[PDB]
Amino acid sequence: KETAAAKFERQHMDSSTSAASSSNYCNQMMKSRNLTKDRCKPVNTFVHESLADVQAVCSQKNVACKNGQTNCYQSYSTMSITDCRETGSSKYPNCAYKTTQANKHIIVACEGNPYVPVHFDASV
């Protein structure tokens, strides 16, 4: 019974590294965060900021979600992130990813009491 908040933290939070660090990072992290268990998740973003700083985005700039819901929020600051994208050669179960580091505004969807991130929508 993983909570929606905990699923967001597993899939999207990595405060321990300042920036993607290594060319190995997406290969290791997509596997260790269990995002390659059932299929190769094609894309995924990790955020290298404190949990409190990501949770605070839920009270920042309200923006439309890609799915048309209204509960998305854009960070006023830029944040350190790593984008993981499956290589063309990647075949499950040997899921392979390119690691790219960026500093961008994040967009998250927030739900619940407490009102916390449950989904990573985009970076801009």
PDB file of C-alpha atoms in Angstrom:
ATOM      1  CA  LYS A   1       0.000   0.000   0.000  1.00  0.00           C
ATOM      2  CA  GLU A   2       2.412   2.720  -1.299  1.00  0.00           C
ATOM      3  CA  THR A   3       0.884   6.216  -0.731  1.00  0.00           C
ATOM      4  CA  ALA A   4       0.698   8.648  -3.661  1.00  0.00           C
ATOM      5  CA  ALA A   5       3.162  10.975  -1.856  1.00  0.00           C
ATOM      6  CA  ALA A   6       5.615   8.084  -1.316  1.00  0.00           C
ATOM      7  CA  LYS A   7       5.302   6.989  -4.982  1.00  0.00           C
ATOM      8  CA  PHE A   8       6.239  10.564  -6.042  1.00  0.00           C
ATOM      9  CA  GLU A   9       9.281  10.496  -3.710  1.00  0.00           C
ATOM     10  CA  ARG A  10      10.426   7.069  -5.034  1.00  0.00           C
ATOM     11  CA  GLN A  11       9.955   7.971  -8.691  1.00  0.00           C
ATOM     12  CA  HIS A  12      11.124  11.602  -8.660  1.00  0.00           C
ATOM     13  CA  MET A  13      13.148  12.702  -5.621  1.00  0.00           C
ATOM     14  CA  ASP A  14      16.940  12.348  -5.360  1.00  0.00           C
ATOM     15  CA  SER A  15      18.171  15.034  -2.966  1.00  0.00           C
ATOM     16  CA  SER A  16      21.472  13.080  -2.241  1.00  0.00           C
ATOM     17  CA  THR A  17      23.178  14.126  -5.585  1.00  0.00           C
ATOM     18  CA  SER A  18      23.560  17.886  -6.459  1.00  0.00           C
ATOM     19  CA  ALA A  19      23.277  17.033 -10.248  1.00  0.00           C
ATOM     20  CA  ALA A  20      22.900  13.818 -12.362  1.00  0.00           C
ATOM     21  CA  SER A  21      26.523  13.127 -11.570  1.00  0.00           C
ATOM     22  CA  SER A  22      27.437  10.228 -13.732  1.00  0.00           C
ATOM     23  CA  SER A  23      26.764   8.891 -17.227  1.00  0.00           C
ATOM     24  CA  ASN A  24      25.713   5.707 -15.223  1.00  0.00           C
ATOM     25  CA  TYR A  25      23.119   7.528 -13.027  1.00  0.00           C
ATOM     26  CA  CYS A  26      19.867   6.878 -15.013  1.00  0.00           C
ATOM     27  CA  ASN A  27      20.822   3.244 -15.631  1.00  0.00           C
ATOM     28  CA  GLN A  28      21.369   2.729 -11.845  1.00  0.00           C
ATOM     29  CA  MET A  29      18.488   4.878 -10.565  1.00  0.00           C
ATOM     30  CA  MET A  30      15.765   3.729 -12.987  1.00  0.00           C
ATOM     31  CA  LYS A  31      16.549   0.160 -11.756  1.00  0.00           C
ATOM     32  CA  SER A  32      17.029   0.949  -8.008  1.00  0.00           C
ATOM     33  CA  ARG A  33      13.781   3.024  -7.829  1.00  0.00           C
ATOM     34  CA  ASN A  34      11.923   0.042  -9.387  1.00  0.00           C
ATOM     35  CA  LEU A  35      10.979   1.898 -12.596  1.00  0.00           C
ATOM     36  CA  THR A  36      12.246  -1.025 -14.789  1.00  0.00           C
ATOM     37  CA  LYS A  37      10.486  -3.885 -12.887  1.00  0.00           C
ATOM     38  CA  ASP A  38       7.512  -4.520 -15.305  1.00  0.00           C
ATOM     39  CA  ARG A  39       8.772  -2.611 -18.426  1.00  0.00           C
ATOM     40  CA  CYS A  40      11.411   0.031 -19.221  1.00  0.00           C
ATOM     41  CA  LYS A  41       9.718   3.294 -18.121  1.00  0.00           C
ATOM     42  CA  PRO A  42      10.503   5.399 -21.232  1.00  0.00           C
ATOM     43  CA  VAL A  43      11.200   8.785 -19.553  1.00  0.00           C
ATOM     44  CA  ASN A  44      11.535   9.926 -15.971  1.00  0.00           C
ATOM     45  CA  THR A  45      12.797  13.006 -14.096  1.00  0.00           C
ATOM     46  CA  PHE A  46      14.678  13.086 -10.748  1.00  0.00           C
ATOM     47  CA  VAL A  47      14.804  16.349  -8.741  1.00  0.00           C
ATOM     48  CA  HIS A  48      17.975  17.245  -6.753  1.00  0.00           C
ATOM     49  CA  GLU A  49      16.448  19.613  -4.259  1.00  0.00           C
ATOM     50  CA  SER A  50      15.294  19.104  -0.661  1.00  0.00           C
ATOM     51  CA  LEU A  51      11.938  17.417  -0.068  1.00  0.00           C
ATOM     52  CA  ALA A  52      10.697  20.608   1.661  1.00  0.00           C
ATOM     53  CA  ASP A  53      11.655  22.744  -1.404  1.00  0.00           C
ATOM     54  CA  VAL A  54       9.747  20.381  -3.783  1.00  0.00           C
ATOM     55  CA  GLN A  55       6.745  20.152  -1.388  1.00  0.00           C
ATOM     56  CA  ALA A  56       6.653  23.977  -1.304  1.00  0.00           C
ATOM     57  CA  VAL A  57       5.922  24.051  -5.063  1.00  0.00           C
ATOM     58  CA  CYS A  58       2.306  23.059  -4.235  1.00  0.00           C
ATOM     59  CA  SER A  59       1.800  26.702  -2.989  1.00  0.00           C
ATOM     60  CA  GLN A  60       3.635  28.321  -5.964  1.00  0.00           C
ATOM     61  CA  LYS A  61       2.455  29.178  -9.500  1.00  0.00           C
ATOM     62  CA  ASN A  62      -0.826  27.388 -10.372  1.00  0.00           C
ATOM     63  CA  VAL A  63      -0.758  26.183 -14.021  1.00  0.00           C
ATOM     64  CA  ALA A  64      -2.870  23.834 -16.134  1.00  0.00           C
ATOM     65  CA  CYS A  65      -1.760  20.178 -16.042  1.00  0.00           C
ATOM     66  CA  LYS A  66      -1.077  18.364 -19.339  1.00  0.00           C
ATOM     67  CA  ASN A  67      -4.167  16.199 -18.626  1.00  0.00           C
ATOM     68  CA  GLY A  68      -6.387  19.344 -18.351  1.00  0.00           C
ATOM     69  CA  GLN A  69      -6.777  19.188 -14.574  1.00  0.00           C
ATOM     70  CA  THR A  70      -6.117  22.427 -12.613  1.00  0.00           C
ATOM     71  CA  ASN A  71      -3.956  21.087  -9.729  1.00  0.00           C
ATOM     72  CA  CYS A  72      -0.459  21.675 -11.224  1.00  0.00           C
ATOM     73  CA  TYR A  73       2.100  24.092  -9.867  1.00  0.00           C
ATOM     74  CA  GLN A  74       5.279  25.534 -11.360  1.00  0.00           C
ATOM     75  CA  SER A  75       8.327  26.356  -9.224  1.00  0.00           C
ATOM     76  CA  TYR A  76       9.214  30.071  -9.119  1.00  0.00           C
ATOM     77  CA  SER A  77      12.906  29.121  -8.898  1.00  0.00           C
ATOM     78  CA  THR A  78      14.792  26.787 -11.180  1.00  0.00           C
ATOM     79  CA  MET A  79      15.737  23.411  -9.714  1.00  0.00           C
ATOM     80  CA  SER A  80      18.526  20.934 -10.441  1.00  0.00           C
ATOM     81  CA  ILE A  81      17.007  17.901 -12.249  1.00  0.00           C
ATOM     82  CA  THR A  82      18.109  14.820 -14.207  1.00  0.00           C
ATOM     83  CA  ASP A  83      16.065  13.655 -17.235  1.00  0.00           C
ATOM     84  CA  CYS A  84      16.303   9.891 -18.000  1.00  0.00           C
ATOM     85  CA  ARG A  85      15.363   8.774 -21.529  1.00  0.00           C
ATOM     86  CA  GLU A  86      15.456   5.171 -22.781  1.00  0.00           C
ATOM     87  CA  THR A  87      18.146   4.612 -25.531  1.00  0.00           C
ATOM     88  CA  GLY A  88      16.907   3.229 -28.929  1.00  0.00           C
ATOM     89  CA  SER A  89      18.998  -0.001 -28.158  1.00  0.00           C
ATOM     90  CA  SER A  90      17.326  -0.515 -24.712  1.00  0.00           C
ATOM     91  CA  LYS A  91      15.487  -3.891 -24.525  1.00  0.00           C
ATOM     92  CA  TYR A  92      13.715  -4.994 -21.310  1.00  0.00           C
ATOM     93  CA  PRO A  93      14.855  -6.314 -18.937  1.00  0.00           C
ATOM     94  CA  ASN A  94      18.260  -4.627 -19.722  1.00  0.00           C
ATOM     95  CA  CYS A  95      16.751  -1.096 -19.695  1.00  0.00           C
ATOM     96  CA  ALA A  96      19.308   1.520 -20.821  1.00  0.00           C
ATOM     97  CA  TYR A  97      19.009   5.308 -20.428  1.00  0.00           C
ATOM     98  CA  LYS A  98      20.775   8.508 -21.360  1.00  0.00           C
ATOM     99  CA  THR A  99      21.465  10.754 -18.312  1.00  0.00           C
ATOM    100  CA  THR A 100      21.016  14.514 -18.853  1.00  0.00           C
ATOM    101  CA  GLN A 101      21.297  17.187 -16.243  1.00  0.00           C
ATOM    102  CA  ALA A 102      19.346  20.471 -16.381  1.00  0.00           C
ATOM    103  CA  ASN A 103      18.339  23.476 -14.256  1.00  0.00           C
ATOM    104  CA  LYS A 104      14.696  24.257 -14.999  1.00  0.00           C
ATOM    105  CA  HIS A 105      11.369  25.160 -13.383  1.00  0.00           C
ATOM    106  CA  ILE A 106       9.462  22.018 -12.398  1.00  0.00           C
ATOM    107  CA  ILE A 107       5.701  21.442 -12.731  1.00  0.00           C
ATOM    108  CA  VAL A 108       4.087  19.020 -10.266  1.00  0.00           C
ATOM    109  CA  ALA A 109       0.493  17.967  -9.574  1.00  0.00           C
ATOM    110  CA  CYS A 110      -0.539  18.161  -5.914  1.00  0.00           C
ATOM    111  CA  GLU A 111      -3.364  16.335  -4.017  1.00  0.00           C
ATOM    112  CA  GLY A 112      -4.446  15.507  -0.466  1.00  0.00           C
ATOM    113  CA  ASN A 113      -4.355  16.809   3.061  1.00  0.00           C
ATOM    114  CA  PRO A 114      -1.549  17.601   3.479  1.00  0.00           C
ATOM    115  CA  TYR A 115      -1.391  19.056  -0.071  1.00  0.00           C
ATOM    116  CA  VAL A 116       1.742  17.442  -1.499  1.00  0.00           C
ATOM    117  CA  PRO A 117       3.242  16.454  -4.866  1.00  0.00           C
ATOM    118  CA  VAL A 118       1.820  13.236  -6.340  1.00  0.00           C
ATOM    119  CA  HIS A 119       2.926  13.605 -10.014  1.00  0.00           C
ATOM    120  CA  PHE A 120       5.750  15.143 -12.054  1.00  0.00           C
ATOM    121  CA  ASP A 121       4.152  16.869 -15.088  1.00  0.00           C
ATOM    122  CA  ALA A 122       6.946  18.771 -16.877  1.00  0.00           C
ATOM    123  CA  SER A 123      10.037  20.910 -16.673  1.00  0.00           C
ATOM    124  CA  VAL A 124      10.229  24.276 -18.452  1.00  0.00           C
TER     125      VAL A 124
END
